Symmetry: C2
Subunit: 43 residues, 2 copies
């Protein structure tokens, strides 16, 4: 497996949590999902 370690703050994490609560809580997976959703436009 590959290893993606980041360093957010409260605003960034809670804005991710606001989307994750619509998914019924998932924040760590939501962070990955959003990158993977962007990757479909990047390549």
């Amino acid at each position: 497996t590959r290893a993606v370690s980041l360093y957010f703050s409260d605003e960034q994490y809670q804005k991710l949590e606001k989307m994750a609560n619509e998914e019924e809580e998932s924040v760590g997976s939501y962070i990955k999902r959003y990158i993977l959703k962007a990757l479909r436009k990047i390549e």
Copy 2:
């Protein structure tokens, strides 16, 4: 600080590394920057 460590794979990493080489190598920071760019206009 709000640490976030996640479980990616080679393609998903290398697509972000290929973008980071445009910035002249910033892999790990480019990831967060893309999410922070998207957070300005999620909707």
